[PDB]
Design a binder for this molecule. Sequence first.
Ligand SMILES: [Mg+2]
Ligand SMILES: [Mg+2]
Ligand SMILES: [Mg+2]
Ligand SMILES: [Mg+2]
Ligand SMILES: [Mg+2]
Ligand SMILES: [Mg+2]
Ligand SMILES: [Mg+2]
Ligand SMILES: [Mg+2]
Ligand SMILES: [Mg+2]
Ligand SMILES: [Mg+2]
Ligand SMILES: [Mg+2]
Ligand SMILES: [Mg+2]
Ligand SMILES: [Mg+2]
Ligand SMILES: [Mg+2]
Ligand SMILES: [Mg+2]
Ligand SMILES: [Mg+2]
Ligand SMILES: [Mg+2]
Ligand SMILES: [Mg+2]
Ligand SMILES: [Mg+2]
Ligand SMILES: [Mg+2]
Lengths: 206, 58, 67, 64, 145, 141, 55, 143, 78
Amino acid sequence: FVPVELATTIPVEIQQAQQEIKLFNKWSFEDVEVKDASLVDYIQISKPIYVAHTAGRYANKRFRKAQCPIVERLTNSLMMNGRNNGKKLKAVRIVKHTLEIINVLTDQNPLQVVVDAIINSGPREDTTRVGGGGAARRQAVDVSPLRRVNQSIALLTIGAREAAFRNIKTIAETLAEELINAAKGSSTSYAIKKKDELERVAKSNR
Amino acid sequence: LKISTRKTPNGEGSKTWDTYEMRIHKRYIDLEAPAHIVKRITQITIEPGVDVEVIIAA
Amino acid sequence: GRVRTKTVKRASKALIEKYYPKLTMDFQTNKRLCDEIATIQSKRLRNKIAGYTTHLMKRIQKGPVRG
Amino acid sequence: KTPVTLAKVIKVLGRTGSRGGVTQVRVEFLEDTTRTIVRNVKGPVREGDILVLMESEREARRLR
Amino acid sequence: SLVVQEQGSFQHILRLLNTNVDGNINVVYALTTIRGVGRRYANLVCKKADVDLHKRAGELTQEELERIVQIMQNPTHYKIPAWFLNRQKDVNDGKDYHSLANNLESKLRDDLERLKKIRSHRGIRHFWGLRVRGQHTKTTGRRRA
Amino acid sequence: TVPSVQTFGKKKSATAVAHVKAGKGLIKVNGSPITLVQPEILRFKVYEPLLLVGLDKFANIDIRVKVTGGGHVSQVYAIRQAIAKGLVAYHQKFVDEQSKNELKKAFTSYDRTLLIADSRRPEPKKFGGRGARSRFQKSYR
Amino acid sequence: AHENVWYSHPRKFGKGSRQCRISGSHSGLIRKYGLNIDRQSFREKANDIGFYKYR
Amino acid sequence: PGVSVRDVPAQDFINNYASFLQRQGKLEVPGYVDIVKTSAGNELPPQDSEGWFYKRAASVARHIYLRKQVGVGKLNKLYGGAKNRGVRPHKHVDASGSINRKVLQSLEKLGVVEISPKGGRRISDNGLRDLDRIAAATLEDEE
Amino acid sequence: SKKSHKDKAKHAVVLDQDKFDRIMKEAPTYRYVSVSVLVDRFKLGGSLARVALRHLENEGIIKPVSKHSKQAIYTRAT
RNA sequence: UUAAUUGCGAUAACGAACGAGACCUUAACCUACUAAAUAGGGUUGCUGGCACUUGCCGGUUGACUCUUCUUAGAGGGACUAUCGGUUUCAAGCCGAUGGAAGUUUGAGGCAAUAACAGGUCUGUGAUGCCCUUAGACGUUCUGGGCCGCACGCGCGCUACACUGACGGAGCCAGCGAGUACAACCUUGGCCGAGAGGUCUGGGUAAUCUUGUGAAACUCCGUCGUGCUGGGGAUAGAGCAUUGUAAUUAUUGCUCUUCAACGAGGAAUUCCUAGUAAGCGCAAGUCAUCAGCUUGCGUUGAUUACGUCCCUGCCCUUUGUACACACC
Ligand SMILES: [Mg+2]
Ligand SMILES: [Mg+2]
Ligand SMILES: [Mg+2]
Ligand SMILES: [Mg+2]
Ligand SMILES: [Mg+2]
Ligand SMILES: [Mg+2]
Ligand SMILES: [Mg+2]
Ligand SMILES: [Mg+2]
Ligand SMILES: [Mg+2]
Ligand SMILES: [Mg+2]
Ligand SMILES: [Mg+2]
Ligand SMILES: [Mg+2]
Ligand SMILES: [Mg+2]
Ligand SMILES: [Mg+2]
Ligand SMILES: [Mg+2]
Ligand SMILES: [Mg+2]
Ligand SMILES: [Mg+2]
Ligand SMILES: [Mg+2]
Ligand SMILES: [Mg+2]
Ligand SMILES: [Mg+2]
């Protein structure tokens, strides 16, 4: 589509219609919508990005973490252990591979799968330690939508990590499996299992 | 020119260090200039602290 | 935690009480006035003094104030 | 059934709890916006969030 | 790219220099399972024998085994350098050898009992079973197991 | 003389100096064309000004970037800033005001760092801590 | 004190080859830029030398 | 139009130049190859047992083309990474000097590398012509 | 140490003819193919997983989506 | 209200002093000034190659010119500036915008009264008293020890692997430091597989090591869940370096044996943004030796932005049979 001539020859697919920013030049941010109304404004699909990698000051004020792209937050939560803590290009590559894998399985544009898994895997009611020492009590409370997003990301990445540990499957494949299973309500997913079990604890401790 | 040094002369106490330093500024100048006036300039206007050195390089 | 301790407040009070006709609403003009009419040693203190002087000038313009 | 309801906070009533980590807000339902509850939240909230509640008769009690 | 690999010939167990070795590992790392042979030495020996590096030990043929075995008993004949050998300069007879599965442990034992008989501080330390190479023992090796 | 300007873009310790001239659409970094930026996964980061603005905006403009200092990704962000700021400065200097403001609107509405240098830089270390803000362990007994 | 044996040990290097230039001590020496003053005397005389606490 | 090695992706250029030098019979390999770690940091010889020397020569020639001029010890600093020092922290360990010296002399024999007046070795006109020729070969190989 | 895993060989270190017909028959019908997916079905050791996975790029039995190292992403040819 | 005995104020209190703040160093921002063959750039020379169109990537201490980056001087800049909320409408807080910067802009340096029987006579030719002062507790020489090992504890380092190990290839910094009456930093060229050796040449330093071409990292392959190609402790043999001297292995290198280790109980440590963490480099120890420390930079987050629940701290009120003060 109108290949611009230059002394430097950028590839055609990089020049085609680039008022149409895609995530990895593969997935469209349009067509992706949040099913739940509570967690909208805490999942950032609105702003297009060409990479899931931005040196954004997303930890200066209190609530800017919401404005960070959701895929970027997933990347930042992948790079979580002492052995691999600063490595983020590795996390970006893992996320890219996971997105391609999810595109392969049930095409369902993988950003929508990511969003749906995050929506489903976040608990809606939780407990807090309120017992006055002598009697141990957990008091059922509600969770902020921002904490719902944070917790969903946390268990998704934790399940991917524990699945990949000393296992044949790559981290990208295990993350894709967890995201796919949490896109539906499949209890085989670790993140959704923790969500359900925590919620039923909180129900048991009204 | 920096030296780190432990404050305590006897090792006892919470680990506390300090850093002493000077700074040296150089500001070299070269002239495509006649002979006698240059040497007179070098031999005049001398302030303690600043050290002047002259290289003919001819 | 910006509270503008004794020195800036007292200096700005004296500045207003001795130079109200010359002071203006604008921070930069009052900054130059602080430079010319008062010998503030540093320049951060000068800037704080001019800022509080502008604030007190604005309060006075709104109406009459104590002190 | 699945009586999952939503509630938009209209005001935040400080932070409570012995831990100091939970907060208390006044939520108003998406329906019947004249019907409000006081509810405990565990996490960062501000005027505008939409909490999800599995209850509607519960009211928040200060945690000690 | 791939081969059916002639069902009925791929060995699964081998006996090279009177030690059993499972043949399904890569050749070099299968050879590594014999005492006195490591990954570097086995890699070089397999390189000199011209057998494929990426081959599996259980599928290489018999005379390949014999050529490999011959190579790794008189290494200096096959241009294996004076260095890179296990036991060089050989302080019994001065001829740089390379100790192998039973020979390695046996000859280490004769050297140990020589150090015991020689009444060297190193030898008596070996006899006692304590650390030898001169490292602190106040806080290390604090249980035998 | 050829209409030409020189701008720069910085990261933590990276620095990309970009010379922009009225060329033939020629974008090289360290003498190599932009398509071969090494980390290859932040490559889209350095195309970002190109695609945000549109290549046809600078088809008769040539770009030469020398990037030094800092690690890989810091260098990449330095090139990003250098290219964006060079485009903006050139348009201001020799093209028009409206074009420059349109470029700034396209840029600053996306990754504000594209025209504004990052202010975050490392914190000096302190004694009694192996990190800039961390501390040693305590025995207590 | 036979001259062959008295003070015969070499002292070209090591801990005791050089002294404090202030106290004659061999512990806690500062060899940076040939100061050769031990640490405590350095802390004492730094301002006279030209060294100041600055940051 | 014209093309230099700066216009081609690196890894492809080293791979193709190594393949071309392996195809022709020139650039004699030292007889001590197949036996050498290529660096004290490394703990095994190259996985590609034969032909790795050609790849090293290709990378070296590209490096001399890109830079001003390079000696042997500088190549030692370039190659070679971190040695697993047993139970001690890793450091930087310079690569083997004999291998890079042999690479430089072999490239001298092929005429692609010339002794520079400022010390070290720079690129030669014939070898630089060969380098850009193979860069073009790779570039039109891509598409 | 503690051999409570009780794992077996559990991996075809060498490919056998019947296993070759097996790899070829469900070379399609495996709508997503990777090295881990291949070894999941007990029929490949894992080193020859790459061998069989690379050989399938012979007559276009499967199509590549990304050929990055450390893994592979392959879909059925349609 | 503030981080603040910081302020607004009320007032038997009025004026003041130290501390805090102010203040300096450092980190930003300066297409504004001064300038630069010990820093860079452009044009043009003289060339190399490829393209053939005048163009690209190079080399030259050849010329002219410039200071954007690199430097460092004088200065500028932010004072919560404008606006909107909230505040006895005052001190001030919250938000947005413009900004480089709006946590005191980040980080520090000094840092009050009073005190501890806190440590140091083992830093001092600082030192009172006591001891010794000739076969000496003085000084020097040789050798040994400060490192032993049934055992407990405190900083750490390497690991338990697939987000990986191992091969190649890519190739990116900032603090430093560096020889004279001695022998330092070492380029480059030859040897050796390596450690290393040798021959020359720079550098008393923005000039040379040095663009410290560092690791993590990236790309392509080997490995494939197997205590396994993880882990590298413990040992055997050999080759070198510093050293008057290396055994009780100084340290480096080559081959081999490859142990415990399956994410670790009670318990407990550090930390809210270029922060933690991973990764290394420089400097101080240095004749040789770091797994140490002080600094520096690379990749770079999750979670808070709150509370007095545990441990404490500040002010006030109260009670006390406590004042060597709840030990
Ligand atoms: Mg750190
Ligand atoms: Mg390397
Ligand atoms: Mg390791
Ligand atoms: Mg300037
Ligand atoms: Mg206001
Ligand atoms: Mg401060
Ligand atoms: Mg005492
Ligand atoms: Mg005495
Ligand atoms: Mg001791
Ligand atoms: Mg300590
Ligand atoms: Mg690697
Ligand atoms: Mg540097
Ligand atoms: Mg390197
Ligand atoms: Mg092993
Ligand atoms: Mg290993
Ligand atoms: Mg590590
Ligand atoms: Mg120490
Ligand atoms: Mg706090
Ligand atoms: Mg009493
Ligand atoms: Mg009691």
